[PDB]
Design a protein around this motif. Sequence first.
Motif, PDB file in Angstrom:
ATOM      1  N   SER A 146     -71.056  56.383 -12.008  1.00 19.04           N
ATOM      2  CA  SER A 146     -70.065  55.250 -11.684  1.00 19.04           C
ATOM      3  C   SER A 146     -68.445  55.720 -11.764  1.00 19.04           C
ATOM      4  O   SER A 146     -68.288  56.775 -12.428  1.00 19.04           O
ATOM      5  CB  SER A 146     -70.094  54.176 -12.821  1.00 19.04           C
ATOM      6  OG  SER A 146     -69.360  53.082 -12.726  1.00 19.04           O
ATOM      7  N   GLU A 203     -66.138  53.030 -11.517  1.00 22.60           N
ATOM      8  CA  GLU A 203     -65.469  51.875 -12.246  1.00 22.60           C
ATOM      9  C   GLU A 203     -64.624  52.100 -13.346  1.00 22.60           C
ATOM     10  O   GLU A 203     -65.037  53.065 -14.297  1.00 22.60           O
ATOM     11  CB  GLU A 203     -66.766  50.667 -12.314  1.00 22.60           C
ATOM     12  CG  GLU A 203     -66.886  49.859 -11.109  1.00 22.60           C
ATOM     13  CD  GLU A 203     -65.561  49.050 -10.686  1.00 22.60           C
ATOM     14  OE1 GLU A 203     -64.477  49.345 -11.216  1.00 22.60           O
ATOM     15  OE2 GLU A 203     -65.940  47.828 -10.346  1.00 22.60           O
ATOM     16  N   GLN A 204     -63.594  51.384 -13.284  1.00 19.66           N
ATOM     17  CA  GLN A 204     -62.446  51.658 -14.181  1.00 19.66           C
ATOM     18  C   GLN A 204     -62.143  50.317 -14.987  1.00 19.66           C
ATOM     19  O   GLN A 204     -62.060  49.385 -14.183  1.00 19.66           O
ATOM     20  CB  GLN A 204     -61.259  52.417 -13.671  1.00 19.66           C
ATOM     21  CG  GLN A 204     -61.448  53.939 -13.327  1.00 19.66           C
ATOM     22  CD  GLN A 204     -60.052  54.593 -13.135  1.00 19.66           C
ATOM     23  OE1 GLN A 204     -59.839  55.549 -13.182  1.00 19.66           O
ATOM     24  NE2 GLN A 204     -59.171  53.584 -12.745  1.00 19.66           N
ATOM     25  N   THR A 214     -63.047  54.827 -17.609  1.00 21.56           N
ATOM     26  CA  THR A 214     -64.356  55.073 -16.734  1.00 21.56           C
ATOM     27  C   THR A 214     -65.665  54.333 -17.394  1.00 21.56           C
ATOM     28  O   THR A 214     -65.803  55.112 -18.498  1.00 21.56           O
ATOM     29  CB  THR A 214     -64.482  56.390 -15.832  1.00 21.56           C
ATOM     30  OG1 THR A 214     -63.525  56.622 -15.178  1.00 21.56           O
ATOM     31  CG2 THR A 214     -65.786  56.334 -14.997  1.00 21.56           C
ATOM     32  N   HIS A 265     -70.806  50.705 -16.307  1.00 20.45           N
ATOM     33  CA  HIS A 265     -70.985  49.247 -15.504  1.00 20.45           C
ATOM     34  C   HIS A 265     -70.060  48.082 -15.845  1.00 20.45           C
ATOM     35  O   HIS A 265     -69.176  48.565 -16.868  1.00 20.45           O
ATOM     36  CB  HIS A 265     -72.115  48.616 -15.894  1.00 20.45           C
ATOM     37  CG  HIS A 265     -73.648  49.446 -15.893  1.00 20.45           C
ATOM     38  ND1 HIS A 265     -74.008  50.167 -16.899  1.00 20.45           N
ATOM     39  CD2 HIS A 265     -74.608  49.373 -14.964  1.00 20.45           C
ATOM     40  CE1 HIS A 265     -75.091  50.884 -16.495  1.00 20.45           C
ATOM     41  NE2 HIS A 265     -75.476  50.459 -15.518  1.00 20.45           N
ATOM     42  N   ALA A 266     -69.457  47.603 -14.874  1.00 18.49           N
ATOM     43  CA  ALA A 266     -68.613  46.703 -14.915  1.00 18.49           C
ATOM     44  C   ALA A 266     -68.743  45.328 -14.140  1.00 18.49           C
ATOM     45  O   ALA A 266     -69.461  45.494 -13.030  1.00 18.49           O
ATOM     46  CB  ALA A 266     -67.293  47.261 -14.373  1.00 18.49           C
ATOM     47  N   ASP A 303     -66.471  42.692 -11.960  1.00 15.48           N
ATOM     48  CA  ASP A 303     -65.199  42.248 -11.331  1.00 15.48           C
ATOM     49  C   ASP A 303     -65.310  40.577 -11.353  1.00 15.48           C
ATOM     50  O   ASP A 303     -66.288  40.122 -10.818  1.00 15.48           O
ATOM     51  CB  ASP A 303     -65.063  42.653  -9.985  1.00 15.48           C
ATOM     52  CG  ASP A 303     -63.579  42.386  -9.372  1.00 15.48           C
ATOM     53  OD1 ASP A 303     -62.762  41.678 -10.087  1.00 15.48           O
ATOM     54  OD2 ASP A 303     -63.535  42.918  -8.179  1.00 15.48           O
ATOM     55  N   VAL A 321     -61.310  42.899 -14.336  1.00 13.66           N
ATOM     56  CA  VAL A 321     -62.534  43.617 -14.371  1.00 13.66           C
ATOM     57  C   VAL A 321     -62.952  43.830 -15.937  1.00 13.66           C
ATOM     58  O   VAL A 321     -62.327  44.452 -16.767  1.00 13.66           O
ATOM     59  CB  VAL A 321     -62.509  44.966 -13.846  1.00 13.66           C
ATOM     60  CG1 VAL A 321     -63.766  45.741 -13.960  1.00 13.66           C
ATOM     61  CG2 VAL A 321     -61.974  45.008 -12.426  1.00 13.66           C
TER      62      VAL A 321
END
Lengths: 321, 321, 321, 158, 158, 158
Positions: C12, C14-15, C25, C28-29, C31, C312
Amino acid sequence: DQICIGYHANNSTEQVDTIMEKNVTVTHAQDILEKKHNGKLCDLDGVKPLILRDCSVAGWLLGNPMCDEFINVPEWSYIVEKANPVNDLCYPGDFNDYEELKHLLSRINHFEKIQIIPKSSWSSHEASLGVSSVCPYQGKSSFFRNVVWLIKKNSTYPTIKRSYNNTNQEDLLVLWGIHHPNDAAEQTKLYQNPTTYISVGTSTLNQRLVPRIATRSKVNGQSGRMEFFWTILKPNDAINFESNGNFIAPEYAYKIVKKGDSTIMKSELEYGNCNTKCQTPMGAINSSMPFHNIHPLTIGECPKYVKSNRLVLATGLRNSP
Amino acid sequence: DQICIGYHANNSTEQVDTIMEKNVTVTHAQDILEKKHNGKLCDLDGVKPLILRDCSVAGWLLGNPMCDEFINVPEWSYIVEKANPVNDLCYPGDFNDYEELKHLLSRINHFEKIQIIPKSSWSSHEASLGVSSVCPYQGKSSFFRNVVWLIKKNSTYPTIKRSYNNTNQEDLLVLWGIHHPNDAAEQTKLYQNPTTYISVGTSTLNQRLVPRIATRSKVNGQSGRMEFFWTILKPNDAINFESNGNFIAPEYAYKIVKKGDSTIMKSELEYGNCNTKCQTPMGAINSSMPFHNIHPLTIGECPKYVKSNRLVLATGLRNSP
Amino acid sequence: DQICIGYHANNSTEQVDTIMEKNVTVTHAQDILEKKHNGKLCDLDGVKPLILRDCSVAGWLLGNPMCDEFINVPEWSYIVEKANPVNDLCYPGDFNDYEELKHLLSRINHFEKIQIIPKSSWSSHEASLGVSSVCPYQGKSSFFRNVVWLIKKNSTYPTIKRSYNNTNQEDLLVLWGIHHPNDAAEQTKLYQNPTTYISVGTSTLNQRLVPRIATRSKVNGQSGRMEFFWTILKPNDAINFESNGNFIAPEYAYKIVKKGDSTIMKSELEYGNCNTKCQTPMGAINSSMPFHNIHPLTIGECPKYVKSNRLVLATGLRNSP
Amino acid sequence: GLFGAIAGFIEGGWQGMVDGWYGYHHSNEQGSGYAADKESTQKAIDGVTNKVNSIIDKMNTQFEAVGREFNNLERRIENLNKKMEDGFLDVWTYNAELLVLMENERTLDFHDSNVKNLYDKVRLQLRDNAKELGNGCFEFYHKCDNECMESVRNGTYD
Amino acid sequence: GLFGAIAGFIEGGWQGMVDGWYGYHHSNEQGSGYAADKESTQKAIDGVTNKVNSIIDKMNTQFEAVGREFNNLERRIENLNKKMEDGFLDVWTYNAELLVLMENERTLDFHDSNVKNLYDKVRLQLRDNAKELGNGCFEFYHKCDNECMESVRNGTYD
Amino acid sequence: GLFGAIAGFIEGGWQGMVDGWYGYHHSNEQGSGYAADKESTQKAIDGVTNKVNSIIDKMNTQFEAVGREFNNLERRIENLNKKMEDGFLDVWTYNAELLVLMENERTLDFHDSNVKNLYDKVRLQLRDNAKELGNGCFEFYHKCDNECMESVRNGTYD
Ligand SMILES: *[C@@H]1O[C@H](CO)[C@@H](O)[C@H](O)[C@H]1NC(C)=O
Ligand SMILES: *[C@@H]1O[C@H](CO)[C@@H](O)[C@H](O)[C@H]1NC(C)=O
Ligand SMILES: *[C@@H]1O[C@H](CO)[C@@H](O)[C@H](O)[C@H]1NC(C)=O
Ligand SMILES: *[C@@H]1O[C@H](CO)[C@@H](O)[C@H](O)[C@H]1NC(C)=O
Ligand SMILES: *[C@@H]1O[C@H](CO)[C@@H](O)[C@H](O)[C@H]1NC(C)=O
Ligand SMILES: *[C@@H]1O[C@H](CO)[C@@H](O)[C@H](O)[C@H]1NC(C)=O
C-alpha cells in the motif's frame, strides 16, 4: 500470599457511547440533557405573561371590541399568541409594517394607554356613527375602541387640522388608519368629498395617504378595507393630522413604560397557574442540566437547546459483567 | 554505578489549560492570541483612509457646505465615519435607499466629481436663490454644493426637460432631490404651479416624484423637507429629467474610478499619522499571531478574531516544582 | 527457538494526514470524499428537469413568443435557467416582486395553464392590435401570449369592469400588467383618456396602478415600459379588474398542480440524456461517499458538500518501508 | 482499552471494593480483603470533575434562537432566517454530541491508565521477591503479613 | 499523566539537562552528568511544530464580520444580521478554545509517552545486568565506565 | 507512536503475515511461519468499522445551501445570504477536516496499543522461561515445538 491490583465494579446499568463503541456499561455517569417539561405556561420569576388567548397583537392594540379582556394590561414577562387567532382585525384590511411592530413589542414589558384625542371633540364631524356589524359588541354594531371612524356631519366633511404634543417623558406608540370604500357612491355617502387624503407628519414622518377605491371580494360580508399605520412619537415631538375624509383617528395611544426583556411566543396553551425560571412554548423547565431538547425558543435562565435525544457523560469506568 | 532517564525542567512560569486541569506549568509555550493594538487610525499599506470627521456619508456626497474639507478627495483605503455625525443633511429630510448606497460605497476606493449640469444654465429658472439659513457658509444662507435648488423666474416655472449623457467609460453616481414645502402658499411662492412632479428616467429607472405637502415639526427651525434620490448611470446611458417645480437638480455627479476593496468603519478616533497592514475601529494591529481579540470588524492582512481572553498552546512539557 | 509479536505490512501507498504528521503511509484507508461528477444535466429519479434554455422564468411565464417550446410543460424535477438568458421580457420593463415569485416557484413541480379571460371577448376594446416589433414571431410584430395588450376601439376606451372566479381546487397564479407610454400623445393614441388607472382586488389585494409617463432611453428601440404584477388567487376567491387604459390583461393563468420539492438552478449546460439521484449545476453525482466537493447547490439524495480537496481516513496501520 | 489493564490483563472489576475506584486485594494467612488506593482515586475524581465543568462551561455560549416574523411577500428572508437558526442548532448539536463521544473515550482510557500506573507502581516495588502472575496479582516469595501488605500499599516496601 | 513517567515514576524534571527535552543522567567512578537524547528530542520538536502549524492552518478560514447598515424600519433584518455575525464568532471562539484545550492535553501526554519509550528502550537493553530501581534509574551489577555509559545511550550495549 | 511498539521497539511490519493485522512469527527446529491473532484483529476491525460509521453519521446533518435571488437594490441582504451560506460551509469543512485529522491519529495509536497489549500478554505468560530480546521476540530457554508454540498463541502456556 498474594496482593492484586484492581478496580471497582457495581450493579450499574448506565450506558455511554464512544466513537468506537456504543452502549458501554459504566460504573457511574452524568446525564446532561434535560428531557422533561411541565406542559404549562407559567409566570416567569413571579411575573405573569400576557396571554392573548383568541386575540392577535393587532386586535389587542387597535382595541378589537372582542378583546375587552385586554383593555388595561399590567406588566408582562412575555406575550403568548396563538398561531391563528380568530379575533384579529374584525373589519377586514391590513396592518402596515406589522412585523416591525411585533419586533418592537418584543423589547417592551409595559404599556400605559392614555387618551390623546377625545371622542367628545370633533364638533365638526360625526364620531358616534363610525360602527360596523362585522365588529359587534353585545349584539350591536361597534368598532375598534382605540380609534374613531369619523363620518360627515350634516352632509359636510370640513378639512381636519388636528395635532397632539407628547408632553410625557416616555415614547408614545400612536396608531391611525384610513378607510378604503369600494365605490364612488360609498365615498360620497360616508364623506361628501370625492377625492380625499390623510396627511401625517412628525419630525421624521412625511406621510400622505390616499384611499384606493376598487371592487373586492366580500370578507366577512364586507368589501371595504381598513389599513392601519403606526409611528413611535418621540418625547417633545408633535404629530400633525390633516384629512378631508377616510380618516380613522386616534382616540387612545400607548405610553411605552418598561422596555424590558421579552418575546411573543406562539403557543396553543392557556395559563397554567405556576411559576418558572425558564419557559418554552410547550411548557416550563426546572433543571440544573446545561442542555435541554424541549424547544429552541425559550425565555429566562435556560439550558442550551440541542436536537439530541441523549447526552450522557462517563464519569466512572467500564463496569464488568 | 547508575544511569537514569529523565526530562527537562526550567524556571518557566508559563501556564496552559487542559480539559482535566487548569494552569499547568509548562517548560515552553506559544501564545497565539494578539491582545495589543496601537489605539490609532492609520494608513493601510501606505494608503490614507477617508476620515469624514464630523460629516456623514450623506453630507459628504450631497456636498453639505460644512463639509468643504471633502470637496475633492483622493483615493482612500477605507472610510471612517462617527456613530452620530453632526454635519448630516443640514436641511432636514431623508436620503432614499441610503443604506444600499453605503453598501455600494464599501466596494469603492475612488470617486472623481464631474459637472453634469452647469449652474450657469437654467436660463428659464432662478438657480442662485435656492438657499437656506439652516445650511450656512461663512455666516450666509447657503445649500448643498452638488445640487441646485431651482426657483421660479419672474413668477414663472416653465416645465423643465433636461438630460445628460454618460460619455465617460466609468459608471456615474447621480444624485437629485425633491422639496416638500409645508403648505399651499409656500408652493406658489417657490413655484407658481400648485400640482407638481419630477420625472426621472434611464434605461432601468421609471420614476415619477410628487411633493407631499403637510404640516410637520420644526427641525432646526424648518418645516419643509428634502428627499434625495440617487441612481447609478451605466456608461452610454442617459438620464432624463422633467419637472415643473420642487426639483433639486444635479450640478455635480461622481465618477466611479476604482472599485477597490473597502469598508465604512464606525469610530470616534481621528487620524493617527501611522501605517499598518491591519486596521480595526479601535486601533491598528501589527502581529504574526493567527488570532486576535481586538474587534470583529477589520481590514487588511489580519489575524482571525475570537472572543477569548487567552489562547496558549503547550509546546514543552510539565515543568516540575 | 523463538516467538515474536508483529504486525502487518503490505505494498500500500495510500497516505493519510494527522495533526503531528502529514502523509503517513498506511496499510489500509477509506476515502470519503466524492471528487468526480459526469458533467451532465440529468433526469432526477426518472423525472426530466425543465430546461429553459435561452428563456428566463419571466419570459416563460408571461409567454414571450420566443419561448414557444414552453407553451405546455410537463411535471419537472427541477428548473434550469442560464445566468443571463437572452429571451426575457422582449418588450422592456420590470417584473414586480420577481424574486419572491422565483422563490414560490422553487416549491412547485407542475403548472397547468388554463384560459381565464378569452381574447374573443372584449367587444368594447381592440385585442388583436396590441403587438410590438420588439416581440416578433415569424417575422411579424407579436406579444406575450398569456396577456392581452388592449387598445381603443373606434377611438373609445370605455371603463373595463371584468372579474374571474377561481372555481378550481388548486391555487391559481394570475399575471397582469400595465403599460407606461413615453409621452402625452402616445397615451391618447393608444388610449383616448389622458389620466388612467388599473385597479386590482381580491380578498387580500387592494391595488391601484397608475401609468408613469416620462422620457427614457431607448431599450431595443423602445421607450415605453411594461410592468408586470402577479398574485396567487386562493380557491373560491375572485379577482376584480377595473381600468380605463394601459391594462395588459390576463388571457391565461397557471394552475398550481404539484407543490413538489424543487430548485431553480443556474447552469449553462444543456440536457444530457441521463438519469441520476443527485444533481449539481455542473454535473450529476453517483456515489456512496458521505461527502463531495463538487458544488454547494444540489438536489436529490446527495452527499454533504465540503470545500476540502482531500478527506481520507486511516483504517489500517502505519505501513513500514 | 488503550492501556491494557481494565478488561485486559485484569479480567474484571471488584464488586467487593466499595470505597474507591482503584485499589488492592490482599490474601495471606491472617485473611483477605480490599483497600482502595485513596491518592489515585482522588486524582481521578478531580480530573473527571474538572472535565465535566470544562465541558459545561465551553457550551454555555451556544446560539439562542429568537422569534422573528415575516409577511406573505417576505418569503426569501423568512426562509433565510429559518435556515440560519437551524444551521446553528445543527452545528451546536454536532459539537455537543461529538465532544461527549470523544471525551467519553478519553475518560474510559484515563481510568485504564490510572489502573496500569497503579499496577506498575507495585511491580516496581516488589521486583524480584514476588512472582508476577499475569492477572493483576503478585504472589510473594516470602510470607507477607498485614503490616507487610500495608507497606506495599503505602509505597514503603523492603 | 497517561503514560506514567513524567511526574509519575520519574518524580520531577532536571534543571541540569539544558540541551534537550529527554535524556540520561549517568553516575560512576569517573563522575556524573547529563546527556540529551537527540533523536527523541528532535522527533518531539517536529511533532509539536507540525501540530502548531496544523492548528494555525485549519483556523485561517474563520468567519470575517462585515459592516452592514439598516434603517429604523428594518429592525428584524438588522437583528438577524447581528445574531448571525455573533453566532459565527461564538462557534469559532468555541472551536479555537476547545482545540487548544484538547491538543494541550495531547501534547503533555506525547511528552510523557516519549519519556516512557526512552525508558523502555534502556530497560530492554540492560535486561538482567542491572537493577531496576523504580525511579527512572538503573543500577549496574558490573562497573560501568564512560564508554560503557555511551553504549547504553547509543543503543549498542552488551 | 504513543505506545512504543509499531515502528518503535518492533522495527517494521511483516509482508509475510497476510491473514491479520497483528500476530506471531515462530521459529524452531521444525520450521518457521506466521499466525494472525484472530481475536485482537477482530476487535480492531469492529472498533475501526464503528468509528467510520460514527464519523459518517455525525456528519449527515450538515448545512444544505439553498438557491436564493435578489434584485439590484437588495444588495445588503444578498451579501448577508452569501456570507451566511459560506460561513456554514467553512464551519463544516473545518469540522470534517479536523475530525479526520484527530481520528486518524487515534486510529494509528489504537493499532500501536493493540500491538503492545498483545506483546505484553505473551511476555506475562512466558515470564522466566524465555529471554526478552528487546525487538518483539522471545528466545526460549527450553526447546519449543509447534504444540508448545500453539500454547503461547492460545494463551495456555506452562
Ligand atoms: C444501544 O442500546 C439501545 C438501548 O437503549 C438500543 O436502542 C440501541 O439500538 C443500541 N445500539 C447499538 C448499536 O447497539
Ligand atoms: C367565486 O365563485 C364561487 C362559485 O360560485 C363563489 O361561491 C364564491 O363566493 C366566489 N367568490 C366570491 C368572492 O364571491
Ligand atoms: C488559574 O490561574 C489564574 C492566574 O492567571 C487565575 O486567575 C485563575 O483563577 C486560575 N484558575 C484556576 C481554576 O485555578
Ligand atoms: C411639543 O410640545 C412641547 C411642550 O410645549 C413643546 O416644547 C415642543 O416644541 C412641541 N413640539 C414641537 C414640534 O414644537
Ligand atoms: C504530502 O504529499 C503530497 C503528495 O500528494 C504533496 O503534494 C504534499 O506537498 C506533501 N505534504 C507535505 C507537507 O509533505
Ligand atoms: C448617450 O450618448 C451616447 C453618445 O452619443 C449615445 O451613443 C447613446 O446612445 C446615448 N444614450 C442613448 C440612450 O441614446
